[PDB]
């Protein structure tokens, strides 16, 4: 098993244990790179109401290695949590936060009633928009939705509406949602595994940056360029 | 001119089983009652939708 010898863990705490979350109309994103992503904490923790992966298994995340990990952080109502998935439609899926139908990543969410509820109206969503969003698209606009021109009124509205989060609300309680999108180029974020001694000129079961197979590893004189991670044969195999 | 179940600009694209024309005269203040979800002298006792 061979990975870059990185001793720095990925800042999931700054995403999942954050003091404030973004409104869904303007969900925030943090790019995770040059670190070791320990997913056993997120998976095994009992604080989560749901942990659903679509292009990966939640228990294979530690063996896999990705080239770029994105954490999308926002707050929605409990009855809208089901919309944070590929192949979905609905007020959030279509106008606030859309995932691609071929989405690869994990959707992690939990009840934050004891943190966000007050009523807490600092969390906004789009009620109106001219057209549907593309996957991972975000847009901030207050243009009045229709013919009104700058004047709010009947049959024309300010695009955003707030959530009213109160401690006594479950489908109307706030949920904190973090979506980890996994781009699978050189390794950037690998799981919590150690590198082992390399053995060559023998048949081995290998794992190089998440790439696995069986074969004999030998020293070679292939003229790899400084930017290249691996090479391919005429048959386009490693 | 107001439509409730359909858009008013799609009426020539749409097709329907049958349509009935309910034709009558009322006072202007009661015109607002000729709509779904309304109450009042007409909506409750004369012409309910």
């Amino acid at each position, epitope marked *: 098993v061979r990975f870059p010898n990185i001793t720095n863990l990925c800042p999931f705490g700054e995403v999942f244990n954050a003091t404030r979350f973004a409104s869904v109309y303007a969900w925030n994103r943090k790019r995770i790179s040059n670190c070791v992503a320990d997913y056993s904490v997120l998976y095994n923790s009992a604080s989560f109401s749901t942990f659903k992966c679509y292009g990966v298994s939640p228990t294979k995340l530690n063996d896999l290695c990705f080239t770029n990990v994105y954490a999308d952080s926002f707050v929605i109502r409990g009855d809208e949590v089901r919309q944070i998935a590929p192949g979905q439609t609905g007020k959030i899926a279509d106008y606030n936060y859309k995932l691609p139908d071929d989405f690869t990543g994990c959707v992690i969410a939990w009840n934050s009633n004891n943190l966000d509820s*007050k*009523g807490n*109206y600092n969390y906004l969503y789009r009620l109106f928009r001219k057209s549907n969003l593309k996957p991972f698209e975000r847009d901030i606009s*207050t243009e009045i939705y229709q*013919p*009104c*021109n*700058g*004047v*709010e*009124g*009947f049959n*024309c*509205y*300010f695009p*955003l*509406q*707030s959530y*009213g989060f*109160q401690p006594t609300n479950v489908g109307y309680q706030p949920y904190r949602v973090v979506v980890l999108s996994f781009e699978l180029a050189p390794a950037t974020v690998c799981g919590p595994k150690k590198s082992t001694n390399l053995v060559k000129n023998k048949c081995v079961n290998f794992n190089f940056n998440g790439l696995t197979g069986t074969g004999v590893l030998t020293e070679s004189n292939k003229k790899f360029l400084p930017f290249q991670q691996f090479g391919r044969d005429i048959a386009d195999t490693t | 001119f107001k439509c409730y179940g359909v858009s008013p600009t799609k009426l020539n694209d749409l097709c329907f089983t049958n349509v009935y024309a309910d034709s009558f005269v009322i006072r*202007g*203040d009661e015109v*607002r*009652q000729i709509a779904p*979800g*309304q*109450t*009042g002298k007409i909506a409750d006792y004369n012409y309910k939708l």
Partner: antibody
Amino acid sequence: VQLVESGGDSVQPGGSLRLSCAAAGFTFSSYWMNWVRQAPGKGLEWVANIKQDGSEKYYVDSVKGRFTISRDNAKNSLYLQMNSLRAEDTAVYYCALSSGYSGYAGNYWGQGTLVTVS
Amino acid sequence: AVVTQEPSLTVSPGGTVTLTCGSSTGAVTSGHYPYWFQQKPGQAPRTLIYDTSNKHSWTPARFSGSLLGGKAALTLSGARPEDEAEYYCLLSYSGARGVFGGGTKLTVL
């Protein structure tokens, strides 16, 4: 969306006063234009309205026959003339823009102009 | 052409509010397309609720344009000191000749 209202001044009872409101930042002839007055220490009193195209006018019965509304769509403004103005009619008049279902009540408000009768 | 309101309401910070308005005849329904306004000292009245329950973009979402038992209301999910104001209601009738209520004063304890 700004409503600029003026014309309020100190006037004598039995006379008349013309108030006016100009629209800015929006189209005038697409909305209904309202007038509301408030005597100091009192609540709001409905005074008058006018339809988007000027074909219809509405008044609270208490000012009927005394108040008249006219407008000029090319200047984006309207005028309210009040005849036989009473000493008791001391109030701030407000211009309001109605974009609602019926056009009967305003959503946007101006700063108001003070009419004092003595 | 008579509209009445509760003269005043006192609410503790974070407490709820139920301001009421209605006509002397019939009952208040969406057909009256009720409006609610907020006026702070030195300010012009500002519309908060229009056409029964539609809330404006400048209105805190703590305010709600609900109806009660044949009456209009403006309620709060948790009042703040910033909300101290005189509130007014306006109902339509046979036409665009609306009538304002007497005014309901809201203060915060």
